[PDB]
DNA sequence: GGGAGTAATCCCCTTGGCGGTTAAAACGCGGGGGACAGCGCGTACGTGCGTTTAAGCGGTGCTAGAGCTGTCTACGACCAATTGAGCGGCCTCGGCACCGGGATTCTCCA
DNA sequence: TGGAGAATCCCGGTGCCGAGGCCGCTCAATTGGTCGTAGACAGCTCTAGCACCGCTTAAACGCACGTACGCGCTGTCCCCCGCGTTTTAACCGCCAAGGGGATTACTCCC
């Protein structure tokens, strides 16, 4: 439960400073947590069904790179 | 004249199965034909990719099920999977 | 003399060309343009009419989508007019221009 | 006798099986795979023709025009997700004027 | 790496437990997931920075996030 | 050049279809430029595929392939 | 004695041209509302410091499950007969585009 | 603010062309049988994924505080829209030469 708080405020700040962002508003964090959740939902579904095709119970790295090649 | 293969009579039959009192034009006929061809090509290519990834030489109904679950979104995917498995069960259980 | 306030004709024209479906760019200038572009790559090439119509449909769809993105970028900067910098922003977010 | 009637479908199954062998998608092809694919294609055809028919009734017309297909695919969420990168000839655009553009007097 | 590894793996197991129970993962898979997520957020923040500089401002806002996602093509 | 045949009211109608109220005077040159770039790319792909297919005339099915390769598929021309 | 080179052609479509003419792009000008610059302010964001906490490294223990090999059996490739669905040519009549008159409905401003 | 007025929907009549049934051919889907091998299933091995514990210490949390700039207001001026009038080329309809792959006859050779 509620493990989206692990993506913390200084980590978000470093991710913004890597892209060149100077100043951060206070409502940025709750939106970037949402877009990270949406992106992870869209990749982990394809990874789960790629694992389910092979009759396996472990998500391998090949399933992850296939799921990422699905999105591009 | 040469022979051209289409899905026109079948989509006309489905259209009369769904809405009995509606017609269709030639441009809309071409659009629906292209739609069926594009969706068929996409699902066939994705099933070929799933066949190549697991080191198999045969495309079966499981590969089409996985390609449908990958390519279609939402409740439409679940309904299409249900209709396909009903059709496969009816074909196999038939005399 | 009757004179409309400046903007009513704009919404009237927006509604009129959002209801319709007829192609906006004329046929023969686009045919001249596609011949003039295509003679540069290879010479003595000919055209079917359906290829020209497909190219017209593609051009209409691409420019309508580009103008919608330009409009959203213009409204974002607290403006109503569209400017070329909005067009450059719209193509840079899409990733078409490096 | 025919396999489409055995499957209880309207789309052909032998034509789909021949198009699967011709495309060189795999060395072997199964038995229920064209049955499954024909059922999926028939079902997608069923919702797109349903929504086109409702749009054609709402527009007070008796025939489906490309404008009705455009309006059918651009108001359903899942079909617009599926056909996001596809353009329809003689289709037009949805009526959408943004809120700030209205003459707020 | 910028995001810590252990909260990210708790997040990916939490978001994957709703799709199939009793699932296991490889370490290369979650490393690839973390790398892809970091690249996605870096590119997103670059595009929202260009959106913010277009609006004659230096502080980014959530409206820049929705502008970047909408012009990008996402929902 | 025949790029001037893509005239001012045509670009105006294209913008009014997109929901644009007011238009600056320098939109038109950039619109002509991006249209020329798009057409050049599509015709280059079409000429490539009709040259590899060994006919002297390019058809609608070839440009359907050309728009299919760029992820911009078009319905309604035999595709 | 049957396969093969050469030519005319019946179409099939493409490109070029020629006259009219008519919608439609093009030019011009008033003016109004919107883009743009400047300023005031007050609040929300960056920085600093104490402090708490949980990530990271190491170390061990255990076992589910990936991964590979053997055997065979059902299932798909493939070939000959054949025959009914599905193609193409033809004909028709109703749905829809269009013209025209009229009532209705936004818009401006005194 | 309500009348003028211009745009817009609505209804009726006309007509014209393509949507859709019908007939006939034909050729690819269906039946039946044979044969070779792809993977279904069991079983064995042993890797790596997970659970748990403890120590250390950099990272994060929370609060104080200055001040930078986001946003609202005001002023200016300029440039694009609305409309009227002038020029112009798209379009339609017809005509003709001609590239081009299949359709015939005409003639020749091992």
Numbering used by the authors:
A (entry chain B): 24 to 95
B (entry chain D): 29 to 123
C (entry chain E): 39 to 136
D (entry chain C): 16 to 120
E (entry chain A): 61 to 135
F (entry chain F): 25 to 103
Quote from the publication:
Unlike other chromatin remodelers, INO80 preferentially mobilizes hexasomes, which can form during transcription. Here, we report cryogenic-electron microscopy (cryo-EM) structures of endogenously purified S. cerevisiae INO80 bound to a hexasome and a nucleosome. We group subunits of the INO80 complex into four modules: Rvb module (Rvb1/Rvb2), Arp8 module (Arp8/Arp4/Actin/Ies4 and Taf14), Ino80 module (Ino80/Ies2) and Arp5 module (Arp5/Ies6). The Ino80 protein consists of three major regions: the N-terminal domain (NTD), the HSA region (Ino80HSA) and the ATPase domain (Ino80ATPase).
Class 3 is the predominant INO80-hexasome class. In the predominant INO80-hexasome structure, Ino80ATPase binds near SHL-2. In class 3 of the INO80-hexasome structure, the Arp8 module engages entirely with ~40 bp of unwrapped DNA that now includes additional DNA unwrapped relative to the unbound hexasome. Compared to the subtle changes at SHL-2 observed when other remodelers bind nucleosomes, the 15 bp of unwrapped DNA (up to SHL-2.5) in class 3 substantially loosens histone DNA interactions and thus may allow more ready translocation from SHL-2. In the most prevalent INO80-hexasome state (class 3), the Arp8 module is bound entirely to the unwrapped DNA, substantially reducing the need to bind flanking DNA. These different binding modes of the Arp8 module could explain why hexasome sliding by INO80 is less dependent on flanking DNA length compared to nucleosome sliding. A site-specific gap at SHL-2 substantially inhibits INO80’s sliding of hexasomes (~2000 fold) while a gap near SHL-6 does not have a major effect. We therefore hypothesize that Ino80ATPase bound at SHL-2 on a hexasome represents the active structure.
